[PDB]
Design a protein around this ligand. Structure first.
Ligand SMILES: Nc1ncnc2c1ncn2[C@@H]1O[C@H](COP(=O)(O)OP(=O)(O)OP(=O)(O)O)[C@@H](O)[C@H]1O
Lengths: 393, 396, 62, 55
């Protein structure tokens, strides 16, 4: 319809996705972090950072670009990252093409602070011809053809739950669990460390391991128990007295040491259970912090923010299971089970894109999608006048 | 449509470019034109510039539009291209008085696109195709895409493109190119020469270069059965050499495999990833060196094959010796394999397949230009409808 | 108030409508290359047969 | 042999240009570059093929 195309940038907590609105797949995806070298040198790029890791130069440091809130952290570095993309991946002056970016749903408290900083970057530093920012979970629901949706972000750096009612992000009901991908990565590392040779530059290496073999492990070794592992285990023992798959072994080669690691099914399940029963992690966590009750909490809070009976029937029939972590086999079904436990009186309808690729970049695809609408004026497009207004006294 | 003799396929590269105006109708053949990718630039009063096929008055500068596969000066590039197109126009016009009554009438243009070109680069290029060369039939294929047809069409496969100063790593899944995984290494055939110079610092660079080209040079794993052998120089000199003729390749190969592993490890659908690993395709002039492809396979094999680590396997066997079921893993690849070549192109069979990417383009070219629909290329109409942007309507 | 919500409701309605439109209209990059794959395979069927028949022709020639 | 005239003979049409453009409903306070249907040296010689042939 319209004579345009644009740059879409999604600063995820782990992956930064960027590309052109012209295409289905992103132009490139790089880690949302960088290597600082010393004079001041900034390394961006998946392979580049890997090569830097291979160098193992003293003084190299890993810094992330996104904080716990899903917001930009080191703004000066952010400039450098985007600059990098414009020069080496997009390969176009930031002044010529339009820029659409996004962010996760928040409670609204930092909205103004973030926009100020973006106006400084986009306009004061990059002279971006036009600027827009959108909400990721909102975009996802919209790409699914949903006006109302229960967005379940089983991703890294925490689990986001966003109740969307009639195109409304219920900010009061939006919750951000501290548990997610990153947590599990930590646990995997710690649980497998007992089988690995020995059991900050070091932290740069941690990043490397996280970006490599750890990610490989979690892609296939982890699996989510259908039922509550504890009860399910008991069940099988009962049945044994009256086959029990929990004893089944799985194999995984530890590439860097060339050795076979072997785990049973139960152990794989044990990792998954941390997202449902965090009180099994330690005494610092409450049963309510598991995804089951967190979801219920956010559902109920959503009801509180506006006819609970209808709200529950609405959200529970528009459930979107997404985020990269959601790809762990069985996760989807387990979510369904948890929902039926806490809402046994409601029919559940969930959605999940079977294509792995689509989920991994779904947030970007959502942004992509919104960026491609013909009624230009629907967005809150920003210009220098908005930066000016902000700074005008 | 379309006349076989009017279909123009152009393949650019960091060194030279292949041009093949017209097809062989019955069969496919190896591109007969080869033009050095260089053009001269004259600086005139106040920086005004001209372009030349030669160095007018020894004042023009040597310009190389393409560097490491990437266009670094699109102005120069389109001028280079322009020269080529009109060169073949005048060539045929002189060879055939009635050329514009037939073969120079409707000319299909197939340009092979190196993945490094930007979105804006591509736009400008299509602009010149329609607004400078006034060509009313344009396809800008992904080079990797062309390659996937040549290997009897593959759904899941890898393209290893060996250049001279760079090597490109491309993964194809479901026939699509995974752009966010596609990368490139700043190493190529020249690095072989560099290491050979290091190895034999007393040799002339040409001795080294011509040796690389020579059949005595080989990647190992009956000149291999001799301690010494010889090769005739460009000047007719007899060059004698020992086992150094089998050296200088591992550095390149190792770096290739490093990125191959890293790239393929990021494929999301492991079922498809498994399929990808069983179809590896190797292309590039340097890959013509005997044994190269096999060595590359071998290096990839030993560094990625999922198989019970040597000793552990022997421990299964050891304990058995006192049948063990296959020790399956959730990982991949379990099978690493090179893709199979087509046996239906004798000409190319005879020439070798280092330039097979052109063949793939040739094959799909007749598939496209004998088809009743124009679904996959830019017409003047489409160009009028969208401008340069039309490319992303037909983008492959 | 009421109409403000209705405005929002129709705004997001039209957003979804444009999206679902493009879901059927777009015909994405992947769709093209996938169909080419299929297309190519049938071409290779011809490659095999036609080359065989070309060989056959030669054999019949002498 | 004038290569430009050869072009005029070969393959026998609105041109576009890359320039600034202002979005409108009405006009919005921003502009961007794109391919606009526009308002409406060279290589100088010809390459001697036969020198560039595989023979
Ligand atoms: N095969 C896999 N299955 C499940 N999870 C995976 C897989 N591969 C990677 N992950 C996890 O997915 C993470 C990236 O996912 P994702 O981009 O959804 O998180 P994120 O988008 O950064 O989080 P946010 O959505 O808050 O930005 C990686 O950190 C990795 O830990």
């Amino acid at each position: 319809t319209l004579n345009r195309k644009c740059v879409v940038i999604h600063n995820g907590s782990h992956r930064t996705v960027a590309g052109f609105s012209n295409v289905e797949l992103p132009q490139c995806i790089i880690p949302s972090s960088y290597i600082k070298r010393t004079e001041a040198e900034f390394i961006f790029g998946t392979y580049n950072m890997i090569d830097a890791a291979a160098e193992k130069r003293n003084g190299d440091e890993v810094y992330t670009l996104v904080d716990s809130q899903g917001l930009p952290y080191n703004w000066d570095a952010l400039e450098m990252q985007w600059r990098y993309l414009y020069d080496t991946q997009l390969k176009v002056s930031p002044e010529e093409l339009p820029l659409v970016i996004t962010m996760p749903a928040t409670n609204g408290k930092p909205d103004m602070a973030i926009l100020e900083r973006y106006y400084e970057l986009a306009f004061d530093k990059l002279n971006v011809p036009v600027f827009q920012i959108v909400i990721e979970p909102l975009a996802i629901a919209l790409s699914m053809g949903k006006s109302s949706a229960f967005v379940i972000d089983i991703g890294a750096s925490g689990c986001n739950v966003t109740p969307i009612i009639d195109g409304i992000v219920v900010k009061n009901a939006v919750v951000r669990s501290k548990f997610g991908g990153d947590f599990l990565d930590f646990q995997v590392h710690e649980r497998l460390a007992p089988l690995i040779k020995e059991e900050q530059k070091r932290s740069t290496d941690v990043w490397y391991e996280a970006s490599t073999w750890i990610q490989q492990f979690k892609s296939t070794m982890l699996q989510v128990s259908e039922k509550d592992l504890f009860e399910l285990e008991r069940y099988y023992k009962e049945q044994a007295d009256i086959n029990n798959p929990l004893v089944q072994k799985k194999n995984f080669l530890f590439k860097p040491l060339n050795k076979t690691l072997t785990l049973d099914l139960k152990e794989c399940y044990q990792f998954a259970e941390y997202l449902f029963k965090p009180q099994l992690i330690s005494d610092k966590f409450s049963p309510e912090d598991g995804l089951g009750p967190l979801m219920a909490k956010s559902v109920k809070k959503a009801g509180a923010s506006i006819s609970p009976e209808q709200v529950y029937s609405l959200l529970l029939t528009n459930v979107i299971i997404t985020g990269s972590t959601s790809l762990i086999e069985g996760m989807e079904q387990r979510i369904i089970k948890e929902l039926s436990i806490r809402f046994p009186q409601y029919k559940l309808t969930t959605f999940a894109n079977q294509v792995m690729m689509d989920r991994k970049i779904q947030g970007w695809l959502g942004a992509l999608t919104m960026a491609n609408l013909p009624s230009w004026s629907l967005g809150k497009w920003y210009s220098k006048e908005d930066y000016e207004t902000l700074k005008r006294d | 449509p379309f006349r076989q003799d009017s279909i123009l396929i152009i393949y650019p590269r960091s060194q030279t470019t292949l041009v093949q105006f017209g097809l062989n109708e019955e069969t496919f053949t190896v591109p007969e034109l080869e033009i050095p990718t260089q053009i001269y630039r004259t600086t005139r009063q106040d920086g005004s510039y001209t372009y030349h096929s030669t160095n007018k008055d020894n004042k023009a500068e040597l310009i190389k539009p393409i560097q490491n596969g990437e266009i670094i000066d699109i102005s120069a590039f389109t001028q280079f291209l322009r020269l080529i197109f009109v060169s073949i126009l005048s060539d045929r016009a002189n060879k055939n008085q009635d050329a514009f009554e037939a073969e120079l009438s409707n000319i299909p243009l197939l340009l092979i696109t190196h993945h490094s070109w930007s979105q804006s680069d591509l736009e400008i290029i299509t602009q010149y195709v329609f607004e400078s060369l006034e060509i009313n039939n344009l396809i800008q294929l992904p080079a990797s895409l062309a390659a996937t047809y040549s290997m009897i069409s593959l759904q899941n496969c890898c393209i290893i493109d060996v250049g001279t100063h760079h090597t490109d790593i491309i993964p194809i899944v479901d026939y699509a190119q995974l752009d966010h995984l596609v990368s490139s290494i700043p190493m190529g055939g020249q690095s072989i020469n560099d290491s050979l110079k290091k190895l034999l610092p007393q040799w002339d660079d040409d001795q080294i270069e011509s040796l690389k080209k020579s059949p005595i040079f080989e990647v190992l794993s009956k000149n291999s059965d001799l301690e010494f052998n010889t090769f005739w120089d460009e000047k007719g000199n007899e060059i004698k050499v020992g086992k150094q003729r089998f050296q200088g390749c591992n550095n390149l190969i190792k770096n290739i495999s490093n990125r191959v592993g890293l790239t393929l490890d990021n494929i999301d659908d492991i079922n498809k990833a498994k399929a990808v690993w069983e179809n590896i395709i190797i292309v590039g002039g340097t890959t013509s060196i005997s044994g190269f492809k096999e060595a590359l396979l071998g290096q990839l094999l030993k560094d990625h094959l999922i198989i019970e680590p040597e000793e552990e396997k022997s421990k299964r066997e050891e304990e058995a010796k006192s049948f063990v079921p296959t020790i399956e893993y959730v990982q991949c690849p379990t099978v690493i394999k090179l893709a199979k070549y087509p046996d239906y192109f004798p000409e190319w069979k005879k020439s070798g397949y280092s330039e097979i990417i052109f063949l793939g383009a040739q094959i799909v070219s007749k598939q496209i230009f004998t088809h009743p629909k124009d679904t996959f290329y830019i017409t003047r109409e489409k160009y009028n409808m969208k401008g340069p942007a039309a490319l992303w309507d037909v983008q492959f | 108030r009421k109409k403000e919500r209705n405005l929002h409701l129709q705004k997001i309605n039209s957003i979804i409508d444009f999206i679902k439109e493009r879901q059927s209209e777009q015909w994405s990059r992947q769709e093209r290359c996938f169909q080419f794959g299929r297309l190519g395979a049938s071409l290779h069927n011809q490659m095999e047969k036609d080359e065989q028949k070309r060989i056959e022709k030669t054999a019949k020639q002498r | 042999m004038d290569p430009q005239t050869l072009i005029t003979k070969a393959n026998k049409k609105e041109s576009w240009r890359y320039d600034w453009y202002q979005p409108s409903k009405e006009k919005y306070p921003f502009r961007y570059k794109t391919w606009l249907r526009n308002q409406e040296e060279s290589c100088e010689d010809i390459l001697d093929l036969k020198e560039f042939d595989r023979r």
